[PDB]
Design an enzyme around this catalytic site. Sequence first.
Site, short mmCIF file in Angstrom:
data_model
loop_
_atom_site.label_atom_id
_atom_site.label_comp_id
_atom_site.label_asym_id
_atom_site.label_seq_id
_atom_site.Cartn_x
_atom_site.Cartn_y
_atom_site.Cartn_z
N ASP A 129 -13.76 11.77 -6.60
CA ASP A 129 -14.17 10.45 -6.08
C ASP A 129 -14.71 10.35 -4.80
OD1 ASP A 129 -15.21 7.82 -6.76
OD2 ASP A 129 -13.28 6.91 -6.67
N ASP A 131 -16.91 9.34 -2.54
CA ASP A 131 -18.06 8.16 -2.49
C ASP A 131 -18.40 8.27 -1.18
OD1 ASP A 131 -18.14 7.69 -5.25
OD2 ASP A 131 -16.74 5.85 -4.91
N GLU A 166 -20.42 12.66 -5.63
CA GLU A 166 -20.35 11.24 -6.01
C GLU A 166 -21.36 10.26 -5.41
OE1 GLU A 166 -18.55 8.35 -7.81
OE2 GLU A 166 -18.96 10.04 -9.12
N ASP A 170 -20.35 2.53 -4.16
CA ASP A 170 -19.85 2.00 -5.61
C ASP A 170 -19.01 0.57 -5.24
OD1 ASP A 170 -20.53 4.09 -7.03
OD2 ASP A 170 -18.91 5.36 -6.92
N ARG A 218 -28.91 4.49 -11.35
CA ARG A 218 -27.84 3.42 -11.01
C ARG A 218 -28.46 2.71 -9.58
NH1 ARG A 218 -21.69 5.98 -11.99
NH2 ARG A 218 -22.31 6.85 -14.21
LU LU Z 1 -17.27 6.82 -7.11
#
Ligand code: LU
Length: 352
Positions: A129, A131, A166, A170, A218
């Site tokens: 993760d 990000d 990633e 987010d 996305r």
């Molecule tokens: Lu993420």
Amino acid sequence: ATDTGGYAATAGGNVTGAVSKTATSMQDIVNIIDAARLDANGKKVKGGAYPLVITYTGNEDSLINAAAANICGQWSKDPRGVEIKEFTKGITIIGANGSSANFGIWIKKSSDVVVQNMRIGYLPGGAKDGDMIRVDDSPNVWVDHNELFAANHECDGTPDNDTTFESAVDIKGASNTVTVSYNYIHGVKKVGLDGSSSSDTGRNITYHHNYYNDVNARLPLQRGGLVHAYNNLYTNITGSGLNVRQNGQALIENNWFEKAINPVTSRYDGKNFGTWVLKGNNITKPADFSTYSITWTADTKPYVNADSWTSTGTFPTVAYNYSPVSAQCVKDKLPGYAGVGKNLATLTSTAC
Ligand SMILES: [Lu+3]
């Protein structure tokens, strides 16, 4: 000031009583935030002791350049990021012109956080993760004038075959009001989500004046709530654009779409399709699809594509005050206002 041109109403650390600190490294940012939790007596204060405006002067081009040459070696490395957990006094992290980071900023259970002028790219730890920016249970956050990049590419043998890198931004949880503006996002496979799961629905997000280029999907992957996307430049979208799901409502106005596959869709759930109000984009009817290289594909599950280019629902009155420039003006001028080093400039009708 509180005006961000979107749902987020915050000034971050630029308030009365703010302390300005200079960070030359990731470590300094951590140490600065930690020190900012102690009062005059050396006791910790819930949410922080005083407001902060941290200027980041570090440069990690060496890490970024080495990662760019070895794209597939990044996912297995330890993720790097500064976590801003439970800090509510107000905080602004401004990258100094020339700065760069190979670490992300992870906001957790905070408020009034502003992230500006940061060049973040090719972060390590995609499988864990990593990000570039993550907003969790954090209302009133403003992500403005940042350059978030990597390589829009997936390497073989990566966990879940989706973790080479990633996401760029987010958003999840109780991050109720957020504005993502003037960002230059390029070479990113998964740009960012708006809801981490079918149950994580809600929030009011405003995506405006962002320049996306060479991105896969996305923009956002929306789950319920409201999303106002105006004055964005969307080019070279390789998979899908705004994916309105879990009954989300989107207001797509005065944007410029070009060389994009499935720019506005609702897919992957096979149900609970979201809606969109289309107004003032360069595309006005299906006849423009061929003009701007817009292609559509089907999905193995029931889906809805905006291939008719007509509104499928409604949208509440946009609370905040904003003034969208024309789609043509974004196409012609936006690239010069979005990103780092533009001195946080904004595109107005006077510059069209
Ligand atoms: Lu993420």
